[model samples]
Target: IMRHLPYFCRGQVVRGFGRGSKQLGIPTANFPEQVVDNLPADISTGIYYGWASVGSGDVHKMVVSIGWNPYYKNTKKSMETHIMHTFKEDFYGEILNVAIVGYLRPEKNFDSLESLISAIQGDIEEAKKRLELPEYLKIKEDNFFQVSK
Candidate 1:
């Protein structure tokens, strides 16, 4: 059986542990709330193709946007992701847990919002087709331990 690890966002830091960030040359968020603090510590900073479980455990195939909004050029460095699925309310304050299955590409600067939105649409489609939730979401319940010789 799989076990779900519950984490709370109470002034913690999210560490990045993947080759994608290094290759892309982007730093991870400094604060816990910057990433998915309600979930386990596995958030990546950059555009990722993965699955997200929103409020009430509603799973959806989504392409996550992780980084500051360079297009606006007014906001400070923040980590926020946009869900591809439709929803009535905004996720501005809600805690979301997104598991990245694959790294689609690094985040880039776009000329306009229309172009950015178009690229996001393509990413969403790729994420949906690439993310096989049933196979990826298997519960690997293991404790953190160090091997002793």
Candidate 2:
């Protein structure tokens, strides 16, 4: 079911472990702990494509990794959003709005760091295409991404 297609939330961005940028080249804004833990049980752990906005910024395409990240082998799950836009500054403490549009694939365990980065890169390419579809595109204009929080 696509019931979760428009999963939306707004929370103040929090600092994460700084793994995405340093370890993977992509920067991600990790949601606050409560925001991550409050995800629906049925949301499933996987790679998801979506739209995101920081504070009052324009919405941008994004790919989210939601899970325990088998490669990192973490025990706690996390929701990390990698926005396509480049930022001149860190957004810690700013409100982050996200609209998850679709699932891409299940989280996987990779044998090498190269493989993991490659997989995530593929997810980004795929999400860029999928987010262009009319159905998904409409969400960019949704009030959820615009309401001044």
Candidate 3:
């Protein structure tokens, strides 16, 4: 079973990680919102598979989400996230530093609201299980490290 991590709601920012044309781009950490009209509906939504931590100048693993909630077919846009393992005060005005470890999958629309909710529940369970397992903390700690080195 996967564990549900708690997170703080940091303030909104125009920029994110990565770079590319605002019109067509995959989500990253260095792209800033160019136009309010063109901005993504849900700046942060969906389930992620990763870790998380709290404190200043300290790096933590976090399963971050930034998108709209198409599950209910709601038109209203929203941004939200669920940090794994660590807990802290509300981040309404704070800035959360998140590094995208990996992309498990992209957001999708379900045939029914119940089906979407069920899928989300499954994702959460998987995320909790993933959190319990050990991860390769170092970027170089991969199978291809020996070949590259």
Candidate 4:
């Protein structure tokens, strides 16, 4: 019912719904429409755990939300990448490489903004823990990232 595991892709980070940081406090690096549209039809809209790197930077654990954010009632489908690592500045337009390794859950609406924020924070914690496994840690060293550097 899903596309291949650890789906790897590289694209430039772009502006998104603008709600990630200003509204939710968690900043998300968004992919261009072309990249979002290219996703396999079977991948389905949901929350995904993965590893990501910006340009030649170190690879970090990430959680990606792929869908028309139900909470915001978005009209367009989007691919948002939220790297677990902190950065000194925004990396917009920089190339972002990600290897989506697992699915967490399908997207859904929250009763309030607080609930939505809580849910997102929960996803981040879960992703951080899950990525500690040897299986996922190995992915951080994959050849896919080596080429980017």
- Which candidate leads the pack in lDDT? 4
* lDDT tens per residue, model 4, 1-149: 66668899998999886898999999999999999999988898999999999999999999999999998888989999999998999999999999999989999999999999999999999999998989889988999999889
* Candidate rank order under lDDT: 4, 2, 1, 3
Clashes of each: 1, 0, 22, 0
Cα lDDT of model 3 by residue, 33-130, tens digit: 33223433443345455433232424444444546545534354433334544344333333444333444555778886567556655665665555
* TM-score-sorted candidate list, best first: 4, 2, 1, 3
Where does model 2 exceed 4 Å of error?
none
Q: Extract clashing residue pairs from model 2.
A: none
Q: Pick the candidate with the highest TM-score.
A: 4
lDDT tens readout by residue for model 2, 90-120: 8999988998889999999999989999999
- Clashes, model 2: 0
lDDT of each: 0.47, 0.89, 0.41, 0.93
Q: RMSD to native for every prediction?
A: 11.2, 1.3, 12.2, 0.9
Find the 10 residues in a row with the least total lDDT in model 2.
1-10
- Give the clashing pairs for model 1: 2-139
Q: How well does each candidate superpose onto the true structure, as a TM-score? A: 0.55, 0.95, 0.44, 0.97
lDDT of 4: 0.93
lDDT of 1 by residue, 84-122 (tens): 566665343444554455667767778865676677667
Clashing pairs in 4: none
